[PDB]
mmCIF file of C-alpha atoms in Angstrom:
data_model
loop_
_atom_site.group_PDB
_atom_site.id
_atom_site.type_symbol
_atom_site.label_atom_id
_atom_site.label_comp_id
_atom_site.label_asym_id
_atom_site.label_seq_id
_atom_site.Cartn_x
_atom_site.Cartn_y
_atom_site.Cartn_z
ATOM 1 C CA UNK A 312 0.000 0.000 0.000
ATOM 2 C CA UNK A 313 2.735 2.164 0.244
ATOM 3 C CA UNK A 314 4.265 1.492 -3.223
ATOM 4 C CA UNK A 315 0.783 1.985 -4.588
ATOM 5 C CA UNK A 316 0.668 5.370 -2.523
ATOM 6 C CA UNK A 317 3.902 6.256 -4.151
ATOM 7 C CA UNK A 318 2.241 5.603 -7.836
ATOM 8 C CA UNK A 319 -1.225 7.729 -7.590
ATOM 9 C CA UNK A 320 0.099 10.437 -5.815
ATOM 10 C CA UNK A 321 2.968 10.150 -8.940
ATOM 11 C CA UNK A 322 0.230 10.247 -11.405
ATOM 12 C CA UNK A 323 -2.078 12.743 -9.296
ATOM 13 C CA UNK A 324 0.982 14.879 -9.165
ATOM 14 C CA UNK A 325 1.917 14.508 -12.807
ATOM 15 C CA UNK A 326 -1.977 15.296 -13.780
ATOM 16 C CA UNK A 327 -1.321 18.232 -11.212
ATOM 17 C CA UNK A 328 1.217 19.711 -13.645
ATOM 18 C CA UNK A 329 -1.536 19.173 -16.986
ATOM 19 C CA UNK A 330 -4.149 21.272 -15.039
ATOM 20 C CA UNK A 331 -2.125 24.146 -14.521
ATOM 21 C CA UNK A 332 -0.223 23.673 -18.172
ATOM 22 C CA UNK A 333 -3.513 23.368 -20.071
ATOM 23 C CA UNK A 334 -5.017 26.641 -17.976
ATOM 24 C CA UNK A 335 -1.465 28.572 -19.156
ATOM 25 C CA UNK A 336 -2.687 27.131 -22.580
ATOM 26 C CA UNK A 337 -6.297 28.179 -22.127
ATOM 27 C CA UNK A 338 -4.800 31.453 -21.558
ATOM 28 C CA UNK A 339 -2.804 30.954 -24.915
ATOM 29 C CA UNK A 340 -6.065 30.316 -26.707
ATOM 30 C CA UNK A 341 -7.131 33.747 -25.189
ATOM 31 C CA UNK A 342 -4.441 35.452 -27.178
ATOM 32 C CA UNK A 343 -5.311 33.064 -30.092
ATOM 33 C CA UNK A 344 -8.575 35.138 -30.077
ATOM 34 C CA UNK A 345 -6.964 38.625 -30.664
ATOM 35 C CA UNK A 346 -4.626 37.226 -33.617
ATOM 36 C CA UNK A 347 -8.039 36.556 -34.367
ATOM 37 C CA UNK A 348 -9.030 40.148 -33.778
ATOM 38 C CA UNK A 349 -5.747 41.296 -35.214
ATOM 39 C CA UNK A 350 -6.964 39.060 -39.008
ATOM 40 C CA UNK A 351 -9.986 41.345 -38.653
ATOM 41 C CA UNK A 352 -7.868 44.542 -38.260
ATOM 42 C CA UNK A 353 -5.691 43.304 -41.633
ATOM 43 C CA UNK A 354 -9.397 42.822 -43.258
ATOM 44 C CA UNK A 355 -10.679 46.237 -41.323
ATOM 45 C CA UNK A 356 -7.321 47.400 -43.192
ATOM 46 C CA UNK A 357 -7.857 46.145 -46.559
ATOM 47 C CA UNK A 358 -11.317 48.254 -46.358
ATOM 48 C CA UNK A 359 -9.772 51.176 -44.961
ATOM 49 C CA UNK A 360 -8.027 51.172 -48.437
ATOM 50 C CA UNK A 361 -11.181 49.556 -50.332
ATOM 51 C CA UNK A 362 -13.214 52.948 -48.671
ATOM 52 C CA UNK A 363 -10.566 55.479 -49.444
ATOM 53 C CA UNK S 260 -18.955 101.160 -83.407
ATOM 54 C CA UNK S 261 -22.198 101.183 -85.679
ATOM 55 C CA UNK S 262 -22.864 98.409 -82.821
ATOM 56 C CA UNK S 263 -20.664 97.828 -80.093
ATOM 57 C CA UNK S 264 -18.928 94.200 -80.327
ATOM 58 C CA UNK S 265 -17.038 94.676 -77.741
ATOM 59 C CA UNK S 266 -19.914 93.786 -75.720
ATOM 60 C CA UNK S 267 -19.425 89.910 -76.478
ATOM 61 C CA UNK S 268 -15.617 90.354 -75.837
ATOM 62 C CA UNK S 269 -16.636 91.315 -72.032
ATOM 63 C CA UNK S 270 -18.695 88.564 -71.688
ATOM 64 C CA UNK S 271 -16.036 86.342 -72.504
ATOM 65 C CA UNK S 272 -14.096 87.559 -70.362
ATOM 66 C CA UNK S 273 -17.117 87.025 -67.417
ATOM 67 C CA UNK S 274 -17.242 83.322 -68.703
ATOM 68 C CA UNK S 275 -13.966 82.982 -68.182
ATOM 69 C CA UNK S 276 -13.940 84.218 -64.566
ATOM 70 C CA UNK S 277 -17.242 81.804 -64.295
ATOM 71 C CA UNK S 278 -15.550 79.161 -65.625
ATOM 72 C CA UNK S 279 -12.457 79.243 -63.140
ATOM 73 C CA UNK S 280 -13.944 79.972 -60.084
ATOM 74 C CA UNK S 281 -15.632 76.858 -60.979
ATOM 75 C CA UNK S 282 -12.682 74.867 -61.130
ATOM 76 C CA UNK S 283 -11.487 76.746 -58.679
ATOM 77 C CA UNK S 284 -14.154 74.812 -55.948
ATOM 78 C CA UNK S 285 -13.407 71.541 -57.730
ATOM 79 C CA UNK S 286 -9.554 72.324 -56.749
ATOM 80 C CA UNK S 287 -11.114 72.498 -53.222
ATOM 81 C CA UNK S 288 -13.579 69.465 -53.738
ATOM 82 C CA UNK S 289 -10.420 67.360 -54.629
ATOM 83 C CA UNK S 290 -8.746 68.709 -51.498
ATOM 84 C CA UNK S 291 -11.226 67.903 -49.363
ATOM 85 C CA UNK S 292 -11.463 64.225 -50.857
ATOM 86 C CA UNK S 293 -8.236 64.142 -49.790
ATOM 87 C CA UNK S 294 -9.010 64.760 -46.565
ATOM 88 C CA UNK S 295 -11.919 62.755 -46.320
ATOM 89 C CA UNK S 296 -9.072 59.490 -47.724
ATOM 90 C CA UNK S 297 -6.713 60.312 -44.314
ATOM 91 C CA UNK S 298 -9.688 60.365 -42.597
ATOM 92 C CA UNK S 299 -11.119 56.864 -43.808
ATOM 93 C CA UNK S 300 -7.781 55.178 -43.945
ATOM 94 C CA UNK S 301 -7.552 56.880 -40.670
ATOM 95 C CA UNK S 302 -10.063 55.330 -39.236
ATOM 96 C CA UNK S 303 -9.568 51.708 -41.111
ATOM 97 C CA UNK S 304 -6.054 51.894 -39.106
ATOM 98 C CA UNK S 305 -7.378 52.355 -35.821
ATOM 99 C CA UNK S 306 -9.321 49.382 -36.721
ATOM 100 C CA UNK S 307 -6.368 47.475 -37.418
ATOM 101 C CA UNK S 308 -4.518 49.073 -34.329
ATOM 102 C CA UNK S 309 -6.850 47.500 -32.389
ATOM 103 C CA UNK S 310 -6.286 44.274 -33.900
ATOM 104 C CA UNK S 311 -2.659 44.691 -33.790
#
């Protein structure tokens, strides 16, 4: 019971370190969505110069 | 001067100050198209600004 306590707090410990690396992530998929908004400013661009 | 000719010859000279002034505003009306392109493309960059 003891080398079975060593595994799942291993694995609880290594899933620890996705939770917080896929929220850092999240928060990369946050800036994602202004490269997003940033595409629209190059199309908002193009009709600056289609209106002008 | 059994009639006065002349006349027509000032006229001319009236349609010619007519005729300039006229092109005189459009001088102006191309200037402020000009203005109203920086103000467009103006406006189109702060769209892409914000995207940037």
């Amino acid at each position: 019971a003891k080398q079975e306590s060593t595994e799942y707090r291993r694995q609880v410990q290594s899933l620890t370190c996705e939770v917080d690396a896929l929220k850092g992530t999240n928060e990369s998929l946050e800036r994602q969505m202004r490269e997003m908004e940033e595409n629209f400013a190059v199309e908002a661009a193009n009709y600056q110069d289609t209106i002008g | 001067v059994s009639k006065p000719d002349l006349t027509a010859a000032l006229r001319d000279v009236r349609q010619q100050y007519e005729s300039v002034a006229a092109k005189n505003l459009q001088e102006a009306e191309e200037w402020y198209k000009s203005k109203f392109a920086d103000l467009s493309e103006a406006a189109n960059r702060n769209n892409d600004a914000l995207r940037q």
